[PDB]
Design a protein around this ligand. Structure first.
Ligand SMILES: COc1ccnc(NN)n1
Length: 330
C-alpha cells in the first residue's frame, strides 16, 4: 500500500503545516501537524476542556462506530516550545492520503496548553519519530508509520514541504519526479528516539564551505533551523544590522535586508536554503525588525533541522531495519 497527502502552511510565514487525516467511522477529518520530532498522535476532542477549544475541529469518539476506549491508558506530552497536552486514549481507524491503519492509538486531549488553544488551525499532532518516545502509559503505543510500515510497498515516508506553498507527505514510495539530481542518504541514530543524523558542514551565502560535523534531528514539527552558536553567528554577521536580542528571543534583522542563503552538507552533497526562507517577518505588526529563521540551539541541548531546512529539500525518512535519512534538492 501507499498514501499521499498534501500538507499546507497554517499561515503566511509557514509557522507550521497541516495535513488532513481521517479518523473513525464515518470519517472525521482533522487537520494535524505531522511531527517527525515526536511520537504521539493526539487530537482535540469532545473530551477537551471546553474553555481550551477555540475554533479547532474535534474528534468525537462516541460518533465513531470503530472507536474503542483503550482502558486505563493516559498520555501527557511536553514539546520543545514549552507547550503541552494530555488525556486518555482510544483506538480507531486512521487514514492519511488513502493509507489506512486499523487500531491506531488516537490520544484524545482532555487538556491542552494555551498555545494550542490559541491556534485554531491545528487540530492535533501526528508523530512520526520513533515509537520509543510515545508517551502513552502504562502500555506504550506505536506511531501511525510504525503501524503502517509492514503494509507499505517500501518502509519509508517522504516530506516535501513547500516554501509559502503546499507540499506533500508520501507513505510507502519515493516519487522520483519530486526532486532533482540524486538523493544522498546518511546514517541515523535512534538512540534518543529521533531522526538524528550528522551534517557534514555549512556555508553562508557564496562563502566557502566549512567542513564540520553537526549532529541534529530532522524535525518537521519545529519551525526554525537551530544550530550551534558559532554557525549562527557566522550567518548573521553577513546581514548588516542583525543582532541577537534577548528581549525578542533570538536573532533579529532589519526588514530592509536581503538575506544570504545558507547551505548545509549531507555527505558530499549540499542543500541550499535560499535567503528568503530565513525571513519570519516583522517581530510585531508594523515593526521594521524581522525575526530570523536560523537561531542558536545553545539553550536546547540538540541541533534541530526544522522546516526552514527541510523545506529546501525532498527528505526521505527510511524506516528499514536500520533507518537512514535521504536528502535531495528540488
Ligand atoms: C518563527 O518563529 C518566530 C518567533 C518570533 N517571531 C517570529 N516572527 N516575527 N517568528
Amino acid at each position: 500500500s501507499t498514501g499521499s497527502a498534501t500538507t499546507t502552511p497554517i499561515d503566511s510565514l509557514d509557522d507550521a503545516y497541516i495535513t488532513p487525516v481521517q479518523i473513525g467511522t464515518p470519517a472525521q477529518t482533522l487537520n494535524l501537524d505531522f511531527d517527525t520530532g515526536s511520537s504521539d498522535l493526539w487530537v482535540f476532542s469532545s473530551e477537551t476542556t471546553a474553555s481550551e477549544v477555540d475554533g479547532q475541529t474535534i474528534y468525537t469518539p462516541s460518533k465513531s462506530t470503530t472507536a474503542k476506549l483503550l482502558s486505563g491508558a493516559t498520555w501527557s506530552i511536553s514539546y520543545g516550545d514549552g507547550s503541552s497536552s494530555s488525556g486518555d486514549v482510544y483506538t480507531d481507524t486512521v487514514s492519511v492520503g488513502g493509507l489506512t491503519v486499523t487500531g491506531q492509538a488516537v490520544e484524545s486531549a482532555k487538556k491542552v496548553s494555551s498555545s494550542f488553544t490559541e491556534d485554531s488551525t491545528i487540530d492535533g499532532l501526528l508523530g512520526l519519530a520513533f515509537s520509543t518516545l510515545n508517551t502513552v502509559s502504562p502500555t506504550q503505543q506505536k506511531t501511525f508509520f510504525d503501524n503502517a510500515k509492514a503494509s507499505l510497498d517500501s518502509p519509508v515516508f517522504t516530506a516535501d514541504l513547500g516554501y509559502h506553498a503546499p507540499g506533500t507527505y508520501n507513505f510507502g514510495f519515493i516519487d522520483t519526479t519530486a526532486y532533482t539530481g540524486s538523493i544522498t542518504y546518511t546514517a541515523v541514530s535512534t538512540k534518543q528516539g529521533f531522526w538524528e543524523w550528522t551534517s557534514t558542514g555549512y556555508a553562508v551565502g557564496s562563502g566557502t564551505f566549512k567542513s564540520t560535523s553537526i549532529d541534529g534531528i530532522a524535525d518537521t514539527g519545529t519551525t526554525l533551523l537551530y544550530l550551534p552558536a558559532t554557525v549562527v553567528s557566522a550567518y548573521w554577521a553577513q546581514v548588516s544590522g542583525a543582532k541577537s536580542s534577548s528581549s525578542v528571543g533570538g536573532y533579529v534583522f532589519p526588514c530592509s535586508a536581503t538575506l544570504p542563503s545558507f547551505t548545509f552538507g549531507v555527505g558530499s552533497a549540499r542543500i541550499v536554503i535560499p535567503g528568503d526562507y530565513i525571513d519570519f517577518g516583522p517581530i510585531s505588526t508594523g515593526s521594521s525588525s524581522c525575526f530570523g529563521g536560523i537561531q542558536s540551539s545553545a539553550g536546547i541541548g540538540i541541533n534541530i533541522f526544522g522546516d526552514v531546512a527541510l523545506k529546501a529539500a525532498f527528505v526521505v525518512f527510511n524506516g528499514a531495519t536500520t533507518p537512514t535519512l535521504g536528502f535531495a534538492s528540488k
